From a paper:
Mycobacterium tuberculosis possesses a Pup-proteasome system analogous to the eukaryotic ubiquitin-proteasome pathway. Mpa (known as ARC in nonmycobacterial species) recognizes prokaryotic ubiquitin-like protein (Pup) that is covalently attached to proteins destined for degradation by bacterial 20S CPs. Similar to the carboxyl (C)-terminal “hydrophobic-Tyr-any amino acid” (HbYX) motif of PAN and the Rpts needed for the activation of 20S CPs, Mpa bears a C-terminal “Gly-Gln-Tyr-Leu” (GQYL) motif for 20S CP gate opening.
Therefore, we used the open gate 20S CP (20SOG) in this study to obtain a stable complex of Mpa–proteasome. In both high-resolution 3D maps at 3.1 to 3.3 Å, we observed a GQYL density inserted in each of the seven activation pockets in the α-rings of 20SOG CPs. The presence of seven GQYL motifs of a hexameric Mpa complex was due to the averaging effect during 3D reconstruction of the 7-fold symmetric M. tuberculosis 20S CP. In the first binding mode observed in five α-subunits (α1 to α4, and α7), the penultimate Mpa Tyr608 hydrogen (H) bonds with Arg26 of α2, but the C-terminal Leu609 carboxylate does not form a salt bridge with α2 Lys52. The GQYL motif was stabilized by two additional H-bonds with the adjacent α3 subunit: between Mpa Gly606 main chain nitrogen and carbonyl oxygen and α3 Asp144 and Ser146, respectively. The Mpa GQYL motif inserts 2 Å deeper in the first interaction mode and 4 Å deeper in the second interaction mode than the PafE GQYL motif. We found that each of the seven α-subunits have rotated by 3° in the Mpa-bound form, leading to the H0 helix to move outward by approximately 3 Å. The H0 outward movement apparently account for the 30 Å open substrate entry pore of the Mpa-bound α-ring.
Author numbering:
A (entry chain V), B (entry chain W), C (entry chain P), D (entry chain c), E (entry chain Q), F (entry chain U), ...: 301 to 522
Write the structure that this text describes.
Amino acid sequence: TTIVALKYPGGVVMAGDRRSTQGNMISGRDVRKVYITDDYTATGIAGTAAVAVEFARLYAVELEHYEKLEGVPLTFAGKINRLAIMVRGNLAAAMQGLLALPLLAGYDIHASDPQSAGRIVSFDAAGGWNIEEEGYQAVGSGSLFAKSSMKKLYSQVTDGDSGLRVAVEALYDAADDDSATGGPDLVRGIFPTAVIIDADGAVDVPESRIAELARAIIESRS
Amino acid sequence: TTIVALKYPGGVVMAGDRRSTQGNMISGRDVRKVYITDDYTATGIAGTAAVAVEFARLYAVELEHYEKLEGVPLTFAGKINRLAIMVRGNLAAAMQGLLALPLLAGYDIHASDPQSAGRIVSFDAAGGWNIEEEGYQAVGSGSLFAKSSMKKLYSQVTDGDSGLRVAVEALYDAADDDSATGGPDLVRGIFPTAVIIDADGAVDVPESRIAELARAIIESRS
Amino acid sequence: TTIVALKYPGGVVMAGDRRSTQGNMISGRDVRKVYITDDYTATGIAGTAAVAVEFARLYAVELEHYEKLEGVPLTFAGKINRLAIMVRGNLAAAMQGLLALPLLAGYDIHASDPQSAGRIVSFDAAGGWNIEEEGYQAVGSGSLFAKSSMKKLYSQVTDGDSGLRVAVEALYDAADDDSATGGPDLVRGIFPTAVIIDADGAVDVPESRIAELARAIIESRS
Amino acid sequence: TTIVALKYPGGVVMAGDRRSTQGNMISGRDVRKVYITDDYTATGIAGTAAVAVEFARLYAVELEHYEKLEGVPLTFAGKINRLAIMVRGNLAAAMQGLLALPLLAGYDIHASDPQSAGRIVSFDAAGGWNIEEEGYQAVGSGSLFAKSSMKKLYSQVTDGDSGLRVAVEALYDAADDDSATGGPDLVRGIFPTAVIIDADGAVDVPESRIAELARAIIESRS
Amino acid sequence: TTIVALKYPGGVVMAGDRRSTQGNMISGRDVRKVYITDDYTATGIAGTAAVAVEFARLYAVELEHYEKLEGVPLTFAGKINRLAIMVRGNLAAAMQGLLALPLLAGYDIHASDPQSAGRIVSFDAAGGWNIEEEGYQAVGSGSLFAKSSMKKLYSQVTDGDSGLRVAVEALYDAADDDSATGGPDLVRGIFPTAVIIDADGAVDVPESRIAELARAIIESRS
Amino acid sequence: TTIVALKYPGGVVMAGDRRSTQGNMISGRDVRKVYITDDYTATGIAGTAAVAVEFARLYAVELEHYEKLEGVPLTFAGKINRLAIMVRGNLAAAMQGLLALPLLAGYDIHASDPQSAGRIVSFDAAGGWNIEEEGYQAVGSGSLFAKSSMKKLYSQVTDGDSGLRVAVEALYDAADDDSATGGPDLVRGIFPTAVIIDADGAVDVPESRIAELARAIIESRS
Amino acid sequence: TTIVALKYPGGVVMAGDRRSTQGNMISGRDVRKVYITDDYTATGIAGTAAVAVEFARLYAVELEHYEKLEGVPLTFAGKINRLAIMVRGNLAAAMQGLLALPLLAGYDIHASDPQSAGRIVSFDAAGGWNIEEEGYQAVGSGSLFAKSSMKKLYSQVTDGDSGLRVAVEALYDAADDDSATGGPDLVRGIFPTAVIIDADGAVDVPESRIAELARAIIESRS
Amino acid sequence: TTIVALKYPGGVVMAGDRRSTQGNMISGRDVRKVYITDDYTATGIAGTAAVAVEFARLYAVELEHYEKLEGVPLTFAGKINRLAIMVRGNLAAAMQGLLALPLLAGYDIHASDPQSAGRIVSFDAAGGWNIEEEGYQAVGSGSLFAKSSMKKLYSQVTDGDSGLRVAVEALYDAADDDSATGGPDLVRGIFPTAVIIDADGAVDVPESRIAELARAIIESRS
Amino acid sequence: TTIVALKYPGGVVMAGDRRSTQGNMISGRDVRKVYITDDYTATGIAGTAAVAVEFARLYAVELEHYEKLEGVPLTFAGKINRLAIMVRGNLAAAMQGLLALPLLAGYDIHASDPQSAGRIVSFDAAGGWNIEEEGYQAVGSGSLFAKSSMKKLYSQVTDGDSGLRVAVEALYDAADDDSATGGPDLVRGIFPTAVIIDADGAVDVPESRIAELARAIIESRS
């Protein structure tokens, strides 16, 4: 599994692959690992697929619950803190095996600068969180290959479209070097999922744009 | 990894994938796992790549050594016995993780019937060997998927070409269900290696024919 | 044990073998593993027979209790969630050897199109659930062989009869390749149990039709 | 695996199943576990298949080696002693999982009464041996079922044909209660192997006779 | 220990041996293992004697307590469920050596056909229960020998007396092949205990009839 | 990680590096390890980054909570005792790897002599504290190198500027001999973070001054 | 440690870093890890520094010993085999912490096409070897980052100087992501060592040229 | 650490060294290990410094708490009992490493004879205590050497000054033979701390007196 | 224990402390750890005292043995290699507990520049060696403090006198921060042992000069 997130001028984008394995045997081919937690934040969890789905559901429920109760959404720092609390509370079971590494992408409406309101927060297993300043991050088994690909490709990111292309290319490299990450499947037409968050909210990227980006990348590599 | 072998009327065919992993990280993309041990026998060893190559080299050296010393090549049962002795003598080292499981394909030149001279020999962990009468066999991590694919496809095998197509399709199925087996990689043009043994001897299949078959299979499943 | 489920145009079919063993010794020859949980959903649990029976009973009581209390049945997502909760609760005992793996087949009456209202859900050991998109799934010790048989036979599934025949054939292949799975008992007249769910509900397939299909398959492979 | 041996007036018969398994997975269907060691001695070794084959080969070589060197065959007690020496020497390997349980059927030509010259010798793990006076013996995973059915059917044994039928029925009962023993496979036409030893020597029973007896037994059970 | 049960036209019969051992030492010669739990059901518990007596005591008390509270006896499925829960609640104590395996014979008065109203229920270690359909069952250390004897003798079971004879003979075979099972003690005049359940109720068999049956069996085998 | 603290005439200065590693892999480059706990005390925690952030946050919350509840800030000894209690209460979690060792620098506003009111408190693993009398202290992996550098450089400390320069040079030496401590980053423009406490309170040192000092040190070392 | 090797039109280049750490402490700042083994081969060992040095010495002595004894140098395959045998022999001590991971760069003077005569050989822990066709390879703790950097910069490689620049940039990225690999020390004037092999042989690259390349890279990334 | 305590006619004196170590590394140079628990009682705790400080604080708080609640101080036997209870309540921590061995010096005001009112109480790990009648006692790493020094020097103890001199000389011997005990530091001017308890209460000894005593001892030993 | 070595223009100087401890107990106060191995090399071994003395004696014997046999002394590289072979051979004992880490100082009479002929060779635990280019190196338990003292004091080294003073001060700092290192004993008159090597050879530094230097350092730090 690999999830990548990167900031572009005016927003953030998070993309993830679709493969689920049980050891070496491929058990899932259309898994979705990027969830729109709320109108301005998307979360993507690597590790055990079961724990990933549970954490996404429970974190979204917590954010919605607070917003409904108090009539105002949490600040981005509050969302970060609640996610870190979930990660810390998962520590014993993570040592036991049920492990989850989240990655959070968000848009800060309360930020003074709309252009630089995109935020990427990474979490370590102990519950600590770090707000990325380099403009990109990855989690999962193929995270190092994806990060080293984005390091070289990040100078091309100038809008949402180029950012999405770079994210898809990072996932492609991660799958090219790591067998637990699924590449773009042209036989089945299964492609990485992506979420773009800007000042207008968090919207799922339709499969058509991702499909044509992946096809262009595969043609370039050939 | 996966190596398949199957008998067709008039000979035997043996195909192998190209991927080698270290964990879930892909480390080799064009590993050759099928070796022409002698003019009428090919061997294919699954497991640790180092031990696989070492075993193939030692086995070929031993067979050629006997042929030079005694002036007559070993009978097929003699070759099977030598390979089984190697596998039995590697048991202790395989208990530490340097495991190797061979699969032997041959053309018995002393068999009365030329049309049923193909032989497939499978070796289990402890050094036992069985001459397969069902006509197909597979070794490796994707061996079960390849075997179950060949079980359904074996009624289409009538000559060398259809046998090769079925072997390539079995490798495709093994790669489809198992991440440690490499599928037909159209981006780099790396395709499974194959060897066909008939009355004329054992000859490597040119990469163009296997590429054509793999492309036809991919198109059919698209 | 092996339990297969597959979608056909207009519904779903779930079939299961009849053998239960204590190690290598056959201890039961007419075990029923496929339960009709409610009028539109059936479940099949592999693993320890005690835990399978207990889980089926508890799950059916849970669904019935909700339907009576609220006057309206649970949505398919609610049923999936309750089953996943049960599996996750079992995990602690499953590590001890009371492992139960369910497979859920259902007919979603709230779907837009009744021609594709069949649903198949697989569960992992940790509790994660996956709604199958390939149209077939299997659990049990012979699940790999059954799935590799259905992969090749699924192009023939057109109606309930085709789906039932393909399911019985997949169970036959699973029993043929796995000793813990029992094939059709021609001397005793014991055959796999199947359930067909369509718009009119979930109905047990009479043993006469399954006997006819099993005899046809055996005569085909002789 | 099950091998049975029983005495009839004027000789002995030894029969064996054909299945070999890898845990729960059926890996061999036409294995031969009964060997004609020499002109008046058959041996059948249960346990690990590789070790069984190696032990049969070694024992036959040792007997023929003594016969050629000393110009006279070993006495029956000498043969029993050599087999017991092999079993006692295999003790460490059996502790390492390379276990072998032999069963020896012979015809003592030097014995006084030619109508009671048959001899069945069972070997325990430690290398002890016992000449069976009950007139029947079994080794293997299903040996208890075979012995308990032979106890009830041994009153029907009067000649070679009745003895062969009783041996095949005992193997059938072993396969009925034990999943690691293969029953008569009427689909593939694979039947238990048998060797009949009498005053004229040891001959393999042709497959047609065993097929007829197996079909009769199956129809009687239906 | 060995306890057998078998259905006959119009009821069920359940017999048990009398020997209790602490290791290889015979400590009890007249232990009673078959209990009349209520007027239409008997239970026989193998394993440790202390836990067996406690289990029978508790089960009888529980059934009687329900009958007195509610004014109607439990249905047969209810009795099976209570016994199964009693078995399942003993997993922790049985892992320390306090294993108790029950076998339940009963007469379903609420069944449609009174001739096929007998029920034999066998429980496995984890608490699973199976209603035997073959007509006989056994528990204990000699259970396999008794079952294999009953498989051959069950065609002679035509009424209550022949069923009782077949049960006693199965016990004799189990005692013959297993040293933990006690045979008929002609010196001390101790014989297996038996209970017959039919439409009129459950009655202990008098010791004289069992004595004469055992004497007939012994004089047959002499 | 490495945090240094040192007194100068009329105050105290505390500096920390910015690198966070996971093993030998650099994961963070702008970590801030020095926190202004309250108007006159700063704290800096070495060890695990998650625990460091959580400890600093909780300690600041505790000090503020007491100040608001009682209307008066804690005495310096009270703050030391609270931090020591918080360190002692983490002894269980520190053994399993969530270690956090703090260093507390403060300006004792109740001290009689303004020019000697800077206080440095070091803590040990068991929660014991020591008010440093040598005038400097360090915590973290490079603490030994930092202390042995401050030993030689402390004669040059005379005011805030010289104290800040000596702290930065000590951090430079720690990074020069330790790879878990990050030195000045003249490519990314990341420099150690410092806090200066004196009679007017605790203020973060602007990055420009630290950049000037680090460049001067680097040019002196070339 | 990180050693990179890459092929360029007309030869091969091999660069390595200079840092040596024991745990986290930097114990060496000018280590040399690329050795000119012979006139057309450079070797570079990652892992334990002592084992690396002694392996380089043993390999050079072995190659020169063969050349002196037999009057002709070893073929490239022979050199690969000797290195692989050395690694396999070390395997046992490598489990004890004395690991050595070699990387071999050579110019095949007997190759048909001298423009493609450069060879890169990688070795796994088990002693197997692979000739890299991707044109680059890396060993050491930072080998993943170096490889993922070269994957994106290999297009630039057109001559010896372009290849050398990419090699230094790959080492820079490895040191940027990994704390066990040393970046270019502009303060001490310590830079990665490099060896260039072409038709004229293997020559050490002068330190000044690598200094210029490293300074250009640092300016580029500032 | 080493703490000595000796009686002289008319009172008691207790002295302690100043070194605190972390293994072989000196972590503290002016630790105060002798505390005035109350007006006529001093205590010195050896072992872990954190536990020593916590124990002294708790013990003093408890004594003052009782004196305030009751208006009368505890008797000496009561104080001994409270200290022994505190020791015995720390056995679990002592077994994991938080050892704390106290040494009590007191002036029994309720004693009959004013000259012999000094009391020295030694405690063991289990909580047992002894009122020492030899007139001196020591705890800590250098306790044995200090004991053996006081054994020879106690004949010179006649008044308070001679007792102080003997205590300082015993500490000097303990530091001379034990490297974890800190001797008089003439360079930093740090000397052992001492408390003299007499009929006028417990008084901290001025550092100047101990400095001149230590200098005289050093001169006499030169 | 601490042995320092440093280069000055025209030679090298190696000094060592005198303390030997058995745990916390000081056993020896006048141990000599610097040995004139031969007229131009001195060696100092830290760790177990027995192993240090044995290594020094054995190494000197080896060097003189070679010189007597071949009529010419070993080159400096040969001496380094012999010492490294001894260190590597001592690895089993070092794991057992007989650790010996050597430090070698020498004068290379064959050097191009007599002023740069001073050589310092540090050996790691695995036997690998490194010629220090820093100009200073320390071995032992206080080696880090000594090295970080010389890092600051090395600019003052301009001749033999300044180098000897810096070595003595580094030993003083190591003893100041480490309790296993013996500082200057002004009472017993025991001072570190130093050896100075220049073109005329290696000569022990007289005790009086080292005493004067130590007294000056102590008075400066007072």
